[PDB]
Amino acid sequence: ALGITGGHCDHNLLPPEFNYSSEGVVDSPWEARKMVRKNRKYGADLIKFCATGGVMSRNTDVNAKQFTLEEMKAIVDEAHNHGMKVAAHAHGLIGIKAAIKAGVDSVEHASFIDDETIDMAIKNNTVLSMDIFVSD
């Protein structure tokens, strides 16, 4: 999964002395581009990125957008260029909005989606992939 430094799909479990980032951590449009290429190269069928923070990660904010829209658009263009679909992890609303705008194929979780951006997903044929059991 592609993420920002310290994102949901980074690994924020080590002291800063280790300087660990996970395999898919990317922090520019062209880095993000390259990671889509690297995933395709080694055989991936789709691209996942993290667009907000999440529940299971340390030190992430669920309502904070992760990635600029510029980075998000780069991930989506490059993946669609190779005929890959794009899923985007997004709990908070500003992330959901931004993922849809970038042109993602599915938004994962989609937890705080409002009326106006439900309709954004309808209009763009964006799918909501929503895990409503797992909270229990």
Residues that bind its own copies (CB under 8 A): 4-7, 10, 12-17, 27-28, 30-31, 33-34, 37-38, 40-43, 58-59, 61, 64-65, 68, 77-78, 81-83
The one-character DSSP state at 80 is H
Rounded CA-CA distance 44/39 in Å is: 5
3-state secondary structure at position 29? helix
129 contact choice in its own copies, ligand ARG, none (CB below 5 to 8 Å, kind-dependent): none
- Indicate whether 83 belongs to the interface with ligand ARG (CB under 6 A): no
CB of 122 to its own copies, least distance (A): 27
Which stretch, 17-25, 35-43, 67-75, 127-135, contacts ligand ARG (CB under 6 A)?
127-135
- Indicate whether 54 belongs to the interface with ligand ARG (CB under 6 A): yes
Residues 52 and 64 sit within 8 Å (Cβ to Cβ): yes
- Indicate whether 135 belongs to the interface with ligand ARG (CB under 6 A): yes
Residues 126 and 104 sit within 8 Å (Cβ to Cβ): yes
Q: Which residues contact 33 (CB under 8 A, 6 or more apart)?
A: 74, 75, 78
Task: Report how many residues bind ligand ARG under the rule CB under 6 A.
Answer: 9
13 contact choice in its own copies, ligand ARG, none (CB below 5 to 8 Å, kind-dependent): its own copies
Sheet of 127-129, strands arranged across:
46-50, 85-90, 106-109, 127-129
Binding region for ligand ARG (CB under 6 A) = 54-57, 91, 109, 131, 134-135
